[PDB]
Amino acid sequence: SIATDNLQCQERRQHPDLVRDWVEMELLKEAELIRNIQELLKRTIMQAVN
Amino acid sequence: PETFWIQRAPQLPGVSNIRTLDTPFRKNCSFSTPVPLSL
Amino acid sequence: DPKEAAAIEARRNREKERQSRFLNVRTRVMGVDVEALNSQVEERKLQ
Amino acid sequence: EQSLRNLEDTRMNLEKDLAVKTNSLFINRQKCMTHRACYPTVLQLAGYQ
Amino acid sequence: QRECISVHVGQAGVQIGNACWELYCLEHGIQPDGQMPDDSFNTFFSETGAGKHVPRAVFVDLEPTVIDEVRTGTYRQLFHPEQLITGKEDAANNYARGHYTIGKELIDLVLDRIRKLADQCTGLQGFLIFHSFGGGTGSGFTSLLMERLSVDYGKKSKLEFSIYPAPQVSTAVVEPYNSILTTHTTLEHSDCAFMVDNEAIYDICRRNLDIERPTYTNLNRLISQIVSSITASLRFDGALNVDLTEFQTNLVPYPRIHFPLATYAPVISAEKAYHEQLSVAEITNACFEPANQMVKCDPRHGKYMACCLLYRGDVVPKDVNAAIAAIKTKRSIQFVDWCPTGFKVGINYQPPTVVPGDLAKVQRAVCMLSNTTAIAEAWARLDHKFDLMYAKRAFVHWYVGEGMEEGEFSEAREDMAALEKDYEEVGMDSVE
Amino acid sequence: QRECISVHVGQAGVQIGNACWELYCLEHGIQPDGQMPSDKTIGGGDDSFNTFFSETGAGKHVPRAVFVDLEPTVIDEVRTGTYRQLFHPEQLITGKEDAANNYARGHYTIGKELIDLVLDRIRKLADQCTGLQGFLIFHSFGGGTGSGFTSLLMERLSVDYGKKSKLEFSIYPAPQVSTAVVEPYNSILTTHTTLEHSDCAFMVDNEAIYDICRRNLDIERPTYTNLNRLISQIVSSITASLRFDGALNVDLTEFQTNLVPYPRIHFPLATYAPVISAEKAYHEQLSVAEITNACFEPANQMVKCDPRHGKYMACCLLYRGDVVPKDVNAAIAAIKTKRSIQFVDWCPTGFKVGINYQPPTVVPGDLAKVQRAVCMLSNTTAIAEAWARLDHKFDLMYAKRAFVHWYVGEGMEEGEFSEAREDMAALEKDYEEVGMDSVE
Amino acid sequence: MREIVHLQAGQCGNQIGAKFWEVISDEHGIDPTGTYHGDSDLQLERINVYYNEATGGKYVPRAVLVDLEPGTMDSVRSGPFGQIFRPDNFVFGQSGAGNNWAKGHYTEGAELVDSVLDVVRKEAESCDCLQGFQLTHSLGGGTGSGMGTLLISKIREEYPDRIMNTFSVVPSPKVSDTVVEPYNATLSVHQLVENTDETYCIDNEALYDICFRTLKLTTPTYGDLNHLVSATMSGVTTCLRFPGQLNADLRKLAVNMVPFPRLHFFMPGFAPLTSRGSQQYRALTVPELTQQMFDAKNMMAACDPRHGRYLTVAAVFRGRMSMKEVDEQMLNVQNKNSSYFVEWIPNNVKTAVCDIPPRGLKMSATFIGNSTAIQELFKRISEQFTAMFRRKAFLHWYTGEGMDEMEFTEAESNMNDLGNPVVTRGAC
Amino acid sequence: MREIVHLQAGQCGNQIGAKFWEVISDEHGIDPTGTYHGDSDLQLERINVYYNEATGGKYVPRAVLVDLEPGTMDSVRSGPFGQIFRPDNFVFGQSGAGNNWAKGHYTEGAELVDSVLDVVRKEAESCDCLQGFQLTHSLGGGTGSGMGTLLISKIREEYPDRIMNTFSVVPSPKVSDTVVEPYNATLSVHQLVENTDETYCIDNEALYDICFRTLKLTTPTYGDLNHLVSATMSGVTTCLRFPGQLNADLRKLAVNMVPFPRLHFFMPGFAPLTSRGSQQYRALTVPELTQQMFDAKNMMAACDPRHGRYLTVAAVFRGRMSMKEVDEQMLNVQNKNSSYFVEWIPNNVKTAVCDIPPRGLKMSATFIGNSTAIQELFKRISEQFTAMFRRKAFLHWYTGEGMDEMEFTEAESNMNDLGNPVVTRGAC
Numbered sequence A: 001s002i003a004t005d006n007l008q009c010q011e012r013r014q015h016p017d018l019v020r021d022w023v024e025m026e027l028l029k030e031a032e033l034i035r036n037i038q039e040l041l042k043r044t045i046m047q048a049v050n
Numbered sequence B: 001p002e003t004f005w006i007q008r009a010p011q012l013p014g015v016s017n018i019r020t021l022d023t024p025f026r027k028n029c030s031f032s033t034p035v036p037l038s039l
Numbered sequence C: 001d002p003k004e005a006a007a008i009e010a011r012r013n014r015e016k017e018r019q020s021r022f023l024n025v026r027t028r029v030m031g032v033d034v035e036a037l038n039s040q041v042e043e044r045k046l047q
Numbered sequence D: 001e002q003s004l005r006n007l008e009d010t011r012m013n014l015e016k017d018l019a020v021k022t023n024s025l026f027i028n029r030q031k032c033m034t035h036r037a038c039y040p041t042v043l044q045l046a047g048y049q
Numbered sequence E: 001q002r003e004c005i006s007v008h009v010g011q012a013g014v015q016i017g018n019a020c021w022e023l024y025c026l027e028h029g030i031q032p033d034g035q036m037p038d039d040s041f042n043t044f045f046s047e048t049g050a051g052k053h054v055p056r057a058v059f060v061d062l063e064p065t066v067i068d069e070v071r072t073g074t075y076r077q078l079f080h081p082e083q084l085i086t087g088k089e090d091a092a093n094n095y096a097r098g099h100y101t102i103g104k105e106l107i108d109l110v111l112d113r114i115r116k117l118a119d120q121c122t123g124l125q126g127f128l129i130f131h132s133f134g135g136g137t138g139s140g141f142t143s144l145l146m147e148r149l150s151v152d153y154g155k156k157s158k159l160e161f162s163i164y165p166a167p168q169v170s171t172a173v174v175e176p177y178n179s180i181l182t183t184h185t186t187l188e189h190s191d192c193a194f195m196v197d198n199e200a201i202y203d204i205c206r207r208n209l210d211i212e213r214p215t216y217t218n219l220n221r222l223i224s225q226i227v228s229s230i231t232a233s234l235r236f237d238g239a240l241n242v243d244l245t246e247f248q249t250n251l252v253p254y255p256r257i258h259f260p261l262a263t264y265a266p267v268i269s270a271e272k273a274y275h276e277q278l279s280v281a282e283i284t285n286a287c288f289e290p291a292n293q294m295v296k297c298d299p300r301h302g303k304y305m306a307c308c309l310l311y312r313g314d315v316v317p318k319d320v321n322a323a324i325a326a327i328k329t330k331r332s333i334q335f336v337d338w339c340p341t342g343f344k345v346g347i348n349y350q351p352p353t354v355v356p357g358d359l360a361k362v363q364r365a366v367c368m369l370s371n372t373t374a375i376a377e378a379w380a381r382l383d384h385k386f387d388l389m390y391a392k393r394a395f396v397h398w399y400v401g402e403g404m405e406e407g408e409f410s411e412a413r414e415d416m417a418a419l420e421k422d423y424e425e426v427g428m429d430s431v432e
Numbered sequence F: 001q002r003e004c005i006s007v008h009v010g011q012a013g014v015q016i017g018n019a020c021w022e023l024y025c026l027e028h029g030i031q032p033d034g035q036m037p038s039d040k041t042i043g044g045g046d047d048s049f050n051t052f053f054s055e056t057g058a059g060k061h062v063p064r065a066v067f068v069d070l071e072p073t074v075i076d077e078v079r080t081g082t083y084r085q086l087f088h089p090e091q092l093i094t095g096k097e098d099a100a101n102n103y104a105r106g107h108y109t110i111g112k113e114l115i116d117l118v119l120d121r122i123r124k125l126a127d128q129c130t131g132l133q134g135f136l137i138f139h140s141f142g143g144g145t146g147s148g149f150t151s152l153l154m155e156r157l158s159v160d161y162g163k164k165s166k167l168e169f170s171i172y173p174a175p176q177v178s179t180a181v182v183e184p185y186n187s188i189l190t191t192h193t194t195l196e197h198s199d200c201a202f203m204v205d206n207e208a209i210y211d212i213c214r215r216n217l218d219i220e221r222p223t224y225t226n227l228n229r230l231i232s233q234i235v236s237s238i239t240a241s242l243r244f245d246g247a248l249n250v251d252l253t254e255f256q257t258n259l260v261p262y263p264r265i266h267f268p269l270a271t272y273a274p275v276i277s278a279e280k281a282y283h284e285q286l287s288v289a290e291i292t293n294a295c296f297e298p299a300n301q302m303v304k305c306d307p308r309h310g311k312y313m314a315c316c317l318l319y320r321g322d323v324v325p326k327d328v329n330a331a332i333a334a335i336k337t338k339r340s341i342q343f344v345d346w347c348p349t350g351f352k353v354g355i356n357y358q359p360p361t362v363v364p365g366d367l368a369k370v371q372r373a374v375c376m377l378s379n380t381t382a383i384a385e386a387w388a389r390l391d392h393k394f395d396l397m398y399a400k401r402a403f404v405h406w407y408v409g410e411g412m413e414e415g416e417f418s419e420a421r422e423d424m425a426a427l428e429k430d431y432e433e434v435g436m437d438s439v440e
Numbered sequence G, H: 001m002r003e004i005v006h007l008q009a010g011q012c013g014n015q016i017g018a019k020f021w022e023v024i025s026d027e028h029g030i031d032p033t034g035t036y037h038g039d040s041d042l043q044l045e046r047i048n049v050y051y052n053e054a055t056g057g058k059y060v061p062r063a064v065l066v067d068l069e070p071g072t073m074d075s076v077r078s079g080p081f082g083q084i085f086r087p088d089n090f091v092f093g094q095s096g097a098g099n100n101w102a103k104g105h106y107t108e109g110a111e112l113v114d115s116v117l118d119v120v121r122k123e124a125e126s127c128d129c130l131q132g133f134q135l136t137h138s139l140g141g142g143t144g145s146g147m148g149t150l151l152i153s154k155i156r157e158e159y160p161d162r163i164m165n166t167f168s169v170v171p172s173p174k175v176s177d178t179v180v181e182p183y184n185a186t187l188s189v190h191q192l193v194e195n196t197d198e199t200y201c202i203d204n205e206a207l208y209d210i211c212f213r214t215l216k217l218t219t220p221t222y223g224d225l226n227h228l229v230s231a232t233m234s235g236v237t238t239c240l241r242f243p244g245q246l247n248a249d250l251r252k253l254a255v256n257m258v259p260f261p262r263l264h265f266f267m268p269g270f271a272p273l274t275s276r277g278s279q280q281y282r283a284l285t286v287p288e289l290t291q292q293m294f295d296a297k298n299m300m301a302a303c304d305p306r307h308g309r310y311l312t313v314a315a316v317f318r319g320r321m322s323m324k325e326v327d328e329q330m331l332n333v334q335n336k337n338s339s340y341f342v343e344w345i346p347n348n349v350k351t352a353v354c355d356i357p358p359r360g361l362k363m364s365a366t367f368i369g370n371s372t373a374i375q376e377l378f379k380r381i382s383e384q385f386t387a388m389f390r391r392k393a394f395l396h397w398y399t400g401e402g403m404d405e406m407e408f409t410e411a412e413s414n415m416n417d418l419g420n421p422v423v424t425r426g427a428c
């Protein structure tokens, strides 16, 4: 939630600010890492209940 | 300056509370800070 | 008649800013309304 | 007079860019860091270990 | 019901009054007409069953002019056309003229008005008198007035804010004579004579407020901010509050030792303020510094007999408790032994009001009423001057003329002697 | 909690303090108008400015300092230039008539119109400090203000705050080159009056910085800007452990407990490490051993006195940045195995190590970016020759009473020169008596 | 059925008992309007101690609010639990105490105690069995010490067989808010010696120190001190308000802490106190309660009990707890601290337990200490009194109101005559 | 159940015991936040030796955290296991150590020792039987010397029949972090001798030698230096925390290792140590353990046992192992090295074996040795003290805090009167 809200918030700025800085790609990497955690944990819970 | 200290900083013995982000070697005299003299 | 019954209300409200302003230690001690103070400078300069 | 209007345009867009930069501080500082500061800790991400 | 008649007597009075009633009016939002554009105002304002709030004061000058400006000013409909009594001939810098000649033709109307404004008071706390010690009316009239008030309003306090003659500057030449003959009027007919002195305020304004060229307006506003703190507990609510009688109980040690000195703390100028925290510690320390006192006198040349720290704003007991401890551990501040606990504390809530002038908007502020023995200095300088002339018999002719025997002059000096001796032997360490 | 109050006397002191406070503001992040732009949110954090800067209502960090000069325009540069909004308007204190290279005018006639004001400001500064660790007194041994008013400040501060520590950072007159004709007079007089009132006095000679700026910084035409900036780096190193955290948090009382063996011997030599000018950072590895050896080399000293003609008593090494305990103890072992560095036989363990994890943040200017620094404070008896050269000059001038009429007619009595010379000679005799080896 | 009439005099006593009424009303389940909104029948079981029934189930506190200034009445009526008192119990005067004991005791205070006595007589006669009275006041100042001691005296000869508990705020050495405070304190302690049955000496400094080293509050306010007073009041009146094993009311607290009729000045203590950041480190049980009680940091009087011998000690616990766990701790303190307890009173600790704990907690325990160390307060007040009295400092304001010299001298001498037995019992 | 009150003084002691609590909570399965998440029921069987139980299944370490600089407490609270200690146990004072024994022993140190003793008395009377105390400090410098030895004296006076282990970091010959190490060590050893029961001398020379020669670290720092001391701290107190065959607690080590009351200075060692490059070449067995224990490269003091006869040796093994190997190897060491052991104590080697090893390791062993070779450690300090004392160096502030020349002379004389017994017992 924090990563998604921060990314959606930082997506808009003024015209001479909005860049692909050293913030946007770290937020995207955090979102991807959170996602991979999510499906890996789903799979691990499935093996656990099996 | 990138040092061995600044890599191992949240595990070093003599490092105070890292409340900020740039240098972990700031000073965070907030726990000591006697209760009558505290904000 | 509603006056005395509103005097209590008045106090209650005037005693709802204390539990906020005072509570913040960094306000009870060092306290300056930058805004009002800034004006006094500009006004004194105009004067 | 041409020089004066040239400096005047420079001041115009300088205040433009300053307001732009200040609202960038507002969106970076007041929104995102404050919403980030409630991040859960290592033990909670481990699952109450 | 905590009413307080304010008898302003003399040019000084009418002018210190102007500032005072302006701060008063804004403090309790009351337009210069007398119409609020809850009961925190009865101390100084009476309601004429219509919303009109008339001031509870009696401006009195044995000459017109000074008051006539207020009658044709912005505060013209506020004051009652009769509260402002004015005479028709100045007292010509002469205690005699203002006490035995031109004043005996205005005292009656003043006392009548005072009773008219002392009947609409359910519980008059005390009278506040603002006069100068070096003028005709200021000395003569206040003398006559305070004497007649003593025989009448006897069990009511009679505080006296005065402008003791300067210790170097001075504006008159007959000043010493008038100030020495008004001693047996602030020693045995007053309940707490807070004496201030222009020379000092000039410095307090030239070094703390940056006004390099102070006028009399930039001076009365300060005397007014001080009188507000000594009358706030009897107006706006607060924590540890302290009324008139209380200040006295915890300040006047013996009957003939009622000459406290005032000292407001946050006297900064919106500009040097940013570079200062302006906290209870600082405000407390200031009041206890010589270059901030309101009477050119070093409190280091004497022992504090008592002290009334009247705080006001966003101060908590915790802070006063601390600031007092630091002052109770400073080799400089030396207190008498016969006063162990020597700090009466008063914490109100309403912060200081700002009248478009100089002092900044301060969230916390403090006024101190201390009974130091370093007042003998001032009482001594003047006597030196009075003695330097009552030997060559200069100007004494005018007084005899306006009705007054030499005896008066002589006696006066002897009295101030007792006073000086007293306020100089009530400090010297004990022998047994 | 760890506050220290800096007071700067004279033109030398005021410009040194200007270069000091610029470095302090860049080290802590306070902008020239007194505002921290990195604590507007996620504030209530840092406390490292509390030894140098207070905190007021409008987020402003007022410096804990008093600039005093008996003559204006050197303070008017501060009140006009880029730091007019940083300092308090009343902390900067000026007179209106110059002391004019006269100890008598600085101490006896024009010091009394300002001593009460300076003491009032110092009193309020010490009142707004919980635990005061020390005064840092920045002055010179030259001019009349920086000698006489400094000595008056020592007397009054010893009266009022006799328990508190008073570190001096002072500009010594040149043994060879100099800039005035009464510098030996004022230097001997204020040496005599500050020997009994300074707890630890660091000495900085001008042509030593000239030589190390010519050699290490490649600046053939240096300026007092560079000189006081290097002094600023030295004092930022000495006040670094009561700013940040390290393995060996080493304090001012630690410094006093290791430098001075006896109460009279309180004059160390300061040295700094990398005086590199960024054309020299491509070729020096700047390892811990290199920065340790450059301190003990007799060419980077800030007083023109060779330590070969003297015995070290004790030295504090103050390491800053990427320094490893094995590297510092290897460097100390190499220093002890080196024979040219002599230590007194009555001090086997003559080292105190302080390690800080906060490397120096540079001013845009001369000095290069380094991950390592060390400030080396050595108490040595080799300062006796630097004393002796000004004693030779003072005797050579006082032999037939030159320039004495100014000092005498201003208000100072004649015996001051004789007692200053006698106490100075006694201090030197103490240096030889302490520096000789033990035979009993 | 037993009941307590609550008197509160002066500004200090008024806010102290206002916090007391707040804490006991929110213990017993009465809203600000006055109705019962609770969850157990035990809250209504013993409500006839502090609450008189009115129409419609609207319980009114059995309190008399006394002041010489009509501003503290406005403050209390504007308080959170302000619309609960009877308005006829708001007795006040359009006058001033002036922080003067003489002006509170020999003047308009005596002119207004007739109305105060009328209201306390009607509230103490609309009864069937009275336990006593609980007066809260400041020992230094006016009204609470001026008219307060006079109220103590006259209610004492009107009801000689009922218990009188005076919660008094003793003055302070280091920081004092008033100047004539040793005069007020000495004069008031003269009547407090031989009028009341329980005295609770609650200094402000000890409350401030508990707010710093125990509670770790960076904002200690008057309400935060008055709540610490109020918790102790609830702890001493809880056993007659709620059931439990080994109940103890005021009388069998009194018969156990008063060995001789003049040694009834206590130092109180409430001690399940812990900070917000250190609460979750605690292990709150009977041993932690015992350590927190018996430490010399949670005393509410500014006297170190290590400088004297404990005459008697009462421990009134509240909560579901074992009995052996209480008895062995009350044993262990006495056995291990052997020089701090008097030898001629064997097992000088009284144990009382109530089942119902205070809200938000599970185990509480209040402490009543009759210590030898209370002589420090009286000797210190006597020292300041002698220092101001040897020169007649601030004495004309008393001789004018009507006192004279030998009453001050007799008050000082009776303070020494109270210091003497608390010296003799401290060394047998 | 038995328990140990842990104490740590100075920056050195604070950091070493912080790493010690890290190590032992790793052993017992305690997370940073204080709760338990492990794998065996044999970890909470004896958790009440170092952890006081709190509410909600939390285990707060029993440790008193003492220093005179208000930054080391902050660093400990902000460390890895910072949110595990009691905030009340963080006892400190806003002052300076000044690396001064006088400033730690006759000043604000003595003004803080009362609050420290209050905390210690809390943790010592929250017990049923206390085995003793475990203080960690450094002799060279302030606080750990001054506060450390003052605490040693007062705790020994209050509790006179409890075991007491002091882990002292003693000054190092080749490099010295502070100048006045010989002064502080000379003034501290005199208090160490006739107070404590088990003193462990850990030297930075031997710590760095284990880091270099044995472990082959690249950049060794204070974390690893304190980790090596936490090794022996965990190893000594293992038989009363985990089950074993032939258990031996603190007193049963002290009886077998202290033949005379003056001789209790030991040289610790922990020896399943190997470099990461030599890790895959190991043959981990009890003979290899004894081989690494009894060499003069693992022993944690800068004293060579080749220069003195072994008075007593103790080997506390930790792992599932055969007792036949242990007994025969401890016999084989004594038989193959005959001149290195005293003859008047036949079989001067003691054996203890615990079953549960340290976590993540198959098998460990700790070494403790009382030897003649503790000569040099006190001797070098004695000549350095004599050299710095003949010329009165660094002493005016020592006498400014309130000492005398005769106390220095007595400290040197008692250093020599410790050296002479371990001279004479090294020569039959």
Ligand SMILES: Nc1nc2c(ncn2[C@@H]2O[C@H](COP(=O)(O)OP(=O)(O)OP(=O)(O)O)[C@@H](O)[C@H]2O)c(=O)[nH]1
Binding pocket: E009, E010, E011, E012, E013, E015, E016, E063, E090, E091, E092, E093, E094, E132, E133, E134, E135, E136, E137, E138, E139, E163, E171, E172, E198, E216, E217, E219, E220, E221
């Ligand atoms: N703030 C302020 N102070 C004033 C003003 N006018 C006079 N004073 C003070 O009053 C002093 C002189 O007042 P007086 O000499 O007594 O004047 P007076 O009361 O009218 O008496 P007469 O001269 O007889 O008319 C001066 O020294 C001032 O300190 C004023 O307008 N504003």
Ligand SMILES: Nc1nc2c(ncn2[C@@H]2O[C@H](COP(=O)(O)OP(=O)(O)OP(=O)(O)O)[C@@H](O)[C@H]2O)c(=O)[nH]1
Binding pocket: F009, F010, F011, F012, F013, F015, F016, F071, F098, F099, F100, F101, F102, F140, F141, F142, F143, F144, F145, F146, F147, F171, F173, F178, F179, F206, F224, F227, F228
């Ligand atoms: N770093 C630095 N050193 C200075 C500066 N100005 C002077 N000095 C040194 O100080 C010595 C004399 O200067 P001061 O002692 O400050 O003279 P002063 O205090 O201004 O005395 P007056 O000239 O009478 O006002 C010279 O030998 C210089 O080496 C400066 O601006 N910066």
Ligand SMILES: Nc1nc2c(ncn2[C@@H]2O[C@H](COP(=O)(O)OP(=O)(O)O)[C@@H](O)[C@H]2O)c(=O)[nH]1
Binding pocket: G009, G010, G011, G012, G013, G015, G016, G097, G099, G138, G139, G140, G141, G142, G143, G144, G145, G169, G176, G177, G178, G204, G222, G223, G225, G226, G229
């Ligand atoms: N605990 C507590 N103490 C208070 C409170 N209000 C005042 N005090 C104390 O009461 C003292 C003075 O009260 P006092 O002058 O006697 O009030 P008075 O009885 O109306 O004259 C101060 O020193 C305060 O410390 C309160 O609300 N709670």
Ligand SMILES: Nc1nc2c(ncn2[C@@H]2O[C@H](COP(=O)(O)OP(=O)(O)O)[C@@H](O)[C@H]2O)c(=O)[nH]1
Binding pocket: B013, H009, H010, H011, H012, H015, H016, H067, H069, H097, H098, H099, H138, H139, H140, H141, H142, H143, H144, H145, H169, H176, H177, H178, H204, H222, H223, H225, H226, H229
């Ligand atoms: N083992 C170990 N030793 C340390 C550590 N930190 C400091 N030391 C040692 O402690 C000694 C000095 O500590 P000291 O000055 O007494 O600290 P203080 O007690 O707070 O004054 C140095 O010689 C270091 O070798 C650490 O983290 N681990």
